[PDB]
Amino acid sequence: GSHSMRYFYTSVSRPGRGEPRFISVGYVDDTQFVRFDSDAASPREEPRAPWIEQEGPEYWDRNTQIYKAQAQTDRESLRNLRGYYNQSEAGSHTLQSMYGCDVGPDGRLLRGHDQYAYDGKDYIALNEDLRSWTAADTAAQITQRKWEAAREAEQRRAYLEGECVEWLRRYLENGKDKLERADPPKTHVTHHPISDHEATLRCWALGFYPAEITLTWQRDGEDQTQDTELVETRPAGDRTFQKWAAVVVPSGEEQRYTCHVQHEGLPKPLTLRWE
């Protein structure tokens, strides 16, 4: 199958409370497998998926040392950003970092990611060519010029193509079926009368993995995008996801409406009707 390893870092300055708080979470696809929190008791990387628990203490100790050095790096990034943005020393600020590798079935890099958000806004992102940067604003152009001059894209590219893919390969080997699985959605339609002239049809997808899914309503095969209420895909808490899509239907017209469900676990999309 197609797979990814991604790390999501959040650093938050707490002015007058010492070092910024550093949090990391690590994922294979939509499966969280590790966390690190600079505020936890005896900060150490911790397992959050069953198949990583087999890693020896040399794993947890090594990753702990890397996270501690990352936290200090992010502290310096936050200090530099304060200067670029002419910000005071009194305000709290956030750096979000995400990097990782997507591989196809051959297990070679398909797509590399390495990107940054400052105070909840795009800052700078490594472009899909892994050779060039997109800066969100004039401040981020300072970082872009520095990173271009220092040829850092070449090191990030070599990392994403090499080490990143090798760790992902090992984790897929550890995880086996727990990571290879595509759990198809359980689908059903419910009917919710509004008045005597109209009813909501709600098309549900439950218990699917991974999270990526498309739910659409059609009326005699014509897409109803503008008249569909679609909730954000939401976690069930058992490493499956949920979604629903709803459309308001005139009474007697229910059999014109079809719900269409596309998911990796379905060889072809499912078509459902109010039944």
Partner: protein
């Protein structure tokens, strides 16, 4: 900094039936900054020993957390999610509806 109000969904892990053990979820997302407070309510009272996920975010930088507890829904018991965030002037309360 530009602040963003949390989105909130409250929902069960499994399609609910009265008397059947289940999990009550409150999913908060798209909030900035990251500090947030989430309580699950039974008939307006805070449920104890609610667990939550580790702080994460989506590729579009949307922070998210899941707060969850075991519960046995009934016909008459009211469940809700109550969120405090710097963007909210009062706690935001979203009632659990088994059809959403």
């Amino acid at each position: 900094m530009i602040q963003r109000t949390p989105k909130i969904q409250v929902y069960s892990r499994h399609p609910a039936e009265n008397g059947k053990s289940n999990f009550l979820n409150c999913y908060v997302s798209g909030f900035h900054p990251s500090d947030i407070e989430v309580d699950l309510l039974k008939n307006g009272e805070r449920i104890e020993k609610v667990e939550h996920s580790d702080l994460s975010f989506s590729k579009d930088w949307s922070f998210y957390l899941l707060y969850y507890t075991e519960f046995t829904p009934t016909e008459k018991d009211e469940y809700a999610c109550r969120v405090n965030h710097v963007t909210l002037s009062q706690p935001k309360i979203v009632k659990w509806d088994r059809d959403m």
